[PDB]
Amino acid sequence: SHYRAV
Amino acid sequence: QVQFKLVLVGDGGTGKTTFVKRHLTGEFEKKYVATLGVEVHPLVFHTNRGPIKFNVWDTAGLEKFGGLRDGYYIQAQCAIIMFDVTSRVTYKNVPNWHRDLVRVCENIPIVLCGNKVDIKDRKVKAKSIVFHRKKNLQYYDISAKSNYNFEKPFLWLARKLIGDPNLEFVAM
Amino acid sequence: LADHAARQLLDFSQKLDINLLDNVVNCLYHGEGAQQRMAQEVLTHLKEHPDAWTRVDTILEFSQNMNTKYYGLQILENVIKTRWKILPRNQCEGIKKYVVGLIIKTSSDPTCVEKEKVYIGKLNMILVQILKQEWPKHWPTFISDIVGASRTSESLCQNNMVILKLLSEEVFDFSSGQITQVKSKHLKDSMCNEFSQIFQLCQFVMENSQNAPLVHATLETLLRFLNWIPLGYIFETKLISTLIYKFLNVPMFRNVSLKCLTEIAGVSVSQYEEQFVTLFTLTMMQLKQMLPLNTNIRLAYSNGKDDEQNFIQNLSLFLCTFLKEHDQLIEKRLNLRETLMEALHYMLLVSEVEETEIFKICLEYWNHLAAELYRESPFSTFDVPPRRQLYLPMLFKVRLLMVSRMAKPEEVLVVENDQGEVVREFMKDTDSINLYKNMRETLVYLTHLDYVDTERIMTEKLHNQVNGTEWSWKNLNTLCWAIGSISGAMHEEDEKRFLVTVIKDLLGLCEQKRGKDNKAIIASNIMYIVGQYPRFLRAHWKFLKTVVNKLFEFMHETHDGVQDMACDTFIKIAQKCRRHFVQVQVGEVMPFIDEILNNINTIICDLQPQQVHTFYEAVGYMIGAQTDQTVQEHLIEKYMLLPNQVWDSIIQQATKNVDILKDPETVKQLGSILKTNVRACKAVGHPFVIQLGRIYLDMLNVYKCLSENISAAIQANGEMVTKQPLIRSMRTVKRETLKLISGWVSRSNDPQMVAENFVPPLLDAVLIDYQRNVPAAREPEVLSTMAIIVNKLGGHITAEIPQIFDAVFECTLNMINKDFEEYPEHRTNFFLLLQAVNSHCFPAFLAIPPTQFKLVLDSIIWAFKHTMRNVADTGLQILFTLLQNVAQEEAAAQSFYQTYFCDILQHIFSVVTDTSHTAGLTMHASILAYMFNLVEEGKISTSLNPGNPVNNQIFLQEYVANLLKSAFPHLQDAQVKLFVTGLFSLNQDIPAFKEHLRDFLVQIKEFAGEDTSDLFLEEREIALRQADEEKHKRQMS
């Protein structure tokens, strides 16, 4: 999927 | 005589100059006069095994007067990152100061100091200060006004640099 | 020579002197005196010049000292960050080639890499800055090229791993405040789209490479990547198994691999349960091999090296993280129960380490576990709850840990005041107090789970103290702190029995022990324990009376610390059991308050003045519990008799001859009397008015006279006279007078009486005296005092606000108008007073001369321009509240708008675009948002351009656009137009407004030239339009 918010 | 280099960094108006001046002369400064660039101040402590000198490089926490910035960190032996427990933004910027510091100093002793703990209204709660954990930094609550814990960071740095966990200041 | 060198360096019409630059930098890094500062200034000026980089290459072609090379790289990085968008493409390509070639050349040589790592790091950071500027639009094949170069060579692979780590840090960790939202999102998407190749390279290096430094660098890069990469790359590959098997057990990879495992464990998803269970199981299996459960982790840490201590800390972190996250997941598996217990065992072992931070992590986990178990079922030992049944075997171990390592309940500090007074103070919320609070909460939860086990542990500890096996002052103090911490955690009957047993055993121990010091320690511990159980003392009157009489007896004990302990315990008991000193107790003829008051002189004959003040505060707490008005008044009169005698004697002496007020001893006596009065007022509250009413006028007579003296002294020998003891005592008297007035007014429940009686004397005694004083002699507390009064009186003091201003306002403004530094306390208190007046006495502002209101507005603007954070925040709050108040009153709203709206907006924008005022950004945005909403709804019904009756919104758009363009000429018209449209569109979304302001702040620091590609004008406009539509829909709803 897409990256994760930090 | 053994003398190290200490780099004191942190946001503007956190108490770096006040802390250094209180250690140098004992007088508390009530007015905020922003530092321009960096000021080098020699502190001398007396341990049970001789005198130890910290050449503190009190840097400017404001971008406008930042100066060389990372140029000061070169050849630094220890560091103190200071923030203000009455302003959350000062703590929120601790990661940035740490990042700038490590890039020039791969592995040095680092003390994270939270100043102004004497003020009744505390904005950075003691339970929210967790940055030092994953970074192997030594955290200390200090107070330049009230002299609370004001000597612990230097003692920890001296112990780390000399490698003697049983080192103490005698104030001879 | 120095000035000539500086001029030569800054003279860009002549060739740079590399030797001179090297000498200057060597002086900076090894100088002594003004030479180092001069070198700093010269280097900063040289870096500032826009044409410095034209010499940077030359420096890198001729410099010998690494410091000068670092300086040149700093200049180059500044140029890349700022002006990269206006340089010719040929120059950009040349810089790219030079940077890449230098990186490759320096990384190729192992000796050069070893010698200078700061140079390599700076070069990598410059490369990352170039990547941020260009990649991927102008460098679409960077990722593939670096992957191939890494695959070809090992040193190049290590350098590329470092570069990729830096890129990830700058794109995902430190993007906010340095990259706009649109460009940050673009960079994140680009990094995530090409991450497959990077992950494949990392996996290849981990699985195949045998070069330890390269594997370490790859592990560090992976640790950095784990913060953001999609979960699939973690929980659907061999990453966890590879880390646990190939690196976790290796001595030189254990720390970094454990950090990676901790980062993986911190993740919380509901579809990778098997992966988390496998992670836990394999990590536990490895740990049991590399760290036997029979090891003494405390001794290992004590004698361990830095790597060992870091490993122990990381192990504690990993255990705490994974347990707090997936304890329920692990519990559900029966076959893993033993493993779970082993994990707990490890925690307990680490809990024995003499390290504050490691213990804090372990205690955080213990608190979480105890809280969860208590929430499951708060009842004590029906069938035991499932989770409690699982954890029963070690809950007693946790209880023993809590009791054996209890932290000090309170922190006491000796501080020298401004005047030189040595004062004992209690810290409110520090790290150590938080530690004690967490330990107390954990122990209270555990005791609620079952009190028999806690009582048994405490009894065993007390027995071991009695028999001498574990006897020491530290152990007794810790045990007594643990006993006190659990107050109220058990029923009244069990508490009574347990406390009776504990006190009997402690008294026996005190009897058996020999020496004054041991007896003092044991007695102090007994007093602390009894003072922590107010319910016990309330239940039994004989015990309470015996305790109080024992405290009075101790108050005559000259042994160090006994009197302070007695006074602290007495005030604690008086506060907690106040209602039991005023009523008549069975077997008594009169209430204990009368008995104490009759013998007050003989009780405090040996106490020090601060202890006397504490005793008076405790007695005042007791007095304040008397509900009857007449008896309370009689008690108050009998209560202040001793201070009042000295007060009256001093007043009569002064009336006979005012010169007595210059006698230092009289001033010390007055200060002590006023401190006693302040403490009594704090303890008693409103009914103390009578005492104040008895001395008020006389106090105001002592204040003013003393004030005058101080001023005279300053006029005779300057400010240095303020350091003399006599002036310090006079200032102490003045400050105590102000403290008494402020305290009573704050605690007084009668604004009308206060305004009628106590304010008019203040107007002349303090305010006009404050005005007549020289600037050096003015007391800042006055202003603060007034603020308090206003905060309490509001509408009852509005009529007096003008006069008050005429006494303090102008004379104060002229003191804090020449700079932002001098008289910090005066600025703070003045703006607090202005805030109080604005919040509670706005009609005073609405009913003053227009010139005075203009001066007030100018003072507020001066306030929010301050470097001091508190002053600026107060100014911003004042401005926001003033805007709301003006909006509330319709009549003057239009006039205020047409007179000050544009000026306030201009000043707000001036502070907003300043880096020194970012801490107040939130408030800035709020104000701005409100203002723009005010201009968009139509509240301003009068055009702000009388000459041209144009729509308010259009006029404001043009005005702000022109103001920003003039302030920052290098901005593009499209940039300013988009910024203004967002200002007028995001006015109902404060977080979005603040993000927009941050985007503008980062934009104005970069010269975008004529390039509109990096601005993402289309995406930003689409976002603004979506926000406008959402706000419109919310308005319709």
Ligand SMILES: Nc1nc2c(ncn2[C@@H]2O[C@H](COP(=O)(O)OP(=O)(O)OP(=O)(O)O)[C@@H](O)[C@H]2O)c(=O)[nH]1
């Ligand atoms: N309440 C309180 N104020 C303090 C304390 N220490 C310093 N201050 C105040 O906080 C401000 C700090 O000013 P400086 O010492 O110049 O701060 P700095 O961080 O060195 O400033 P820059 O050089 O601009 O980064 C001043 O107002 C100090 O008087 C403290 O322990 N308590």
Ligand SMILES: [Mg+2]
């Ligand atoms: Mg400073």
